Amino acid sequence: MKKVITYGTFDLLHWGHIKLLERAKQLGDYLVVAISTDEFNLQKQKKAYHSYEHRKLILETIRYVDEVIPEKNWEQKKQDIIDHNIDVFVMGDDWEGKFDFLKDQCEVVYLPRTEGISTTKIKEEI
Amino acid sequence: MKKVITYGTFDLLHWGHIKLLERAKQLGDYLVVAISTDEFNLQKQKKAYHSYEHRKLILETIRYVDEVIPEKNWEQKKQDIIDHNIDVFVMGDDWEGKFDFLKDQCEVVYLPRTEGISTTKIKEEI
Ligand SMILES: Nc1ccn([C@@H]2O[C@H](COP(=O)(O)OP(=O)(O)OP(=O)(O)O)[C@@H](O)[C@H]2O)c(=O)n1
Ligand SMILES: Nc1ccn([C@@H]2O[C@H](COP(=O)(O)OP(=O)(O)OP(=O)(O)O)[C@@H](O)[C@H]2O)c(=O)n1
């Protein structure tokens, strides 16, 4: 079984998020999404409209998502790859090159973001 | 096959929408969701943040949803029930009694809304 992992907040779920999940899932057989907890968001001074419990709840109903785990800090990535036996690590290309140190443990793939949509723009346009 | 139908806008998808979809699906084997088109929304003077195409796209990825059709006007309900061979019609209880005339064609069920969450509150709190 080829396991894939990706990290993010997924606060006001939009089509850009969906396209990412779609493409990440097609890189394996099982997709795990690690999402920022509310404590971690506070550390990043990036408050999410929806709580961790609600963001997880909604993510768990998306066809592409197999499992959702909490992202509590910046450092947990290497152990997650080990703990969950991850074969593919996927991130948006705005992180291009940042996680190349994980390549000795799994395949690292940077997918281009979907243009014209993001959670802050939604908030700014409201 | 017991088919279910429900109508709505499903603009900024939240846990209240998810719980409705979950409960509606458990009333049958197949769930069809009719969502307001942007033209109908203009007619209702209730503009959605996300377009019809993006609202449909996101709804189609929810595990509970089997099919998504366009809701173009207020009068289409009886023909939809005929056209899609609907057995169960589900609406929020805030519509309790408004569609009781469809009872000679199928079962009509009003489910209680989820408290503390709605698309306007999200918009108001942003
Ligand atoms: N238009 C977009 C928006 C997000 N993503 C991807 O979604 C994943 C995580 O989602 P998130 O960061 O929560 O969405 P954003 O809209 O980028 O959130 P924000 O605008 O608040 O930074 C990232 O891999 C990001 O590249 C994407 O591919 N295309
Ligand atoms: N907290 C909520 C919000 C919506 N719904 C149900 O979702 C369906 C349609 O969703 P929608 O009306 O688009 O969501 P709202 O949050 O009610 O959007 P708005 O505040 O603009 O009316 C309705 O049958 C409604 O009862 C619900 O059960 N609980």
- Tell me how the structure was determined: X-ray
Q: Quick check: A86 and A103 in contact, CB under 8 A?
A: no
Q: Is B28 annotated as a binding residue?
A: no
- Which residues does residue A7 pair with via DSSP β-bridges, in sequence order? A34
Interface with A, mutate which of B13, B50, B54, B61 (most A CBs under 10 A) = B61
d(CA A47, CA B10): 23
Burial of A116 (C-beta count, 10 Å sphere; 0-12/13-18/19+): exposed
SS3 B19: helix
Hey, are the CB atoms on B15 and A58 less than 8 Å from each other? yes
Residue of A nearest to B11 (CA): A14
Q: Which domains does chain B have, with CATH numbers?
A: 1-126 (3.40.50.620)
CA-nearest of B62, B43, B45, B46 to B9 is B46
Give chain B's contact residues with A (Cβ, < 8 Å): 12-15, 18, 21-22, 49-50, 54, 57-58, 61-64, 122-123, 125-126
Ligand nearest to the CA of A41: 1
DSSP string, B110-126: EEPPPTT--HHHHHHT-
DSSP state for residue A67 in the 8-state scheme = E
Q: Quick check: B86 and B106 in contact, CB under 8 A?
A: yes
The H-assigned helical ranges of B14-74 are 15-25, 38-44, 52-59
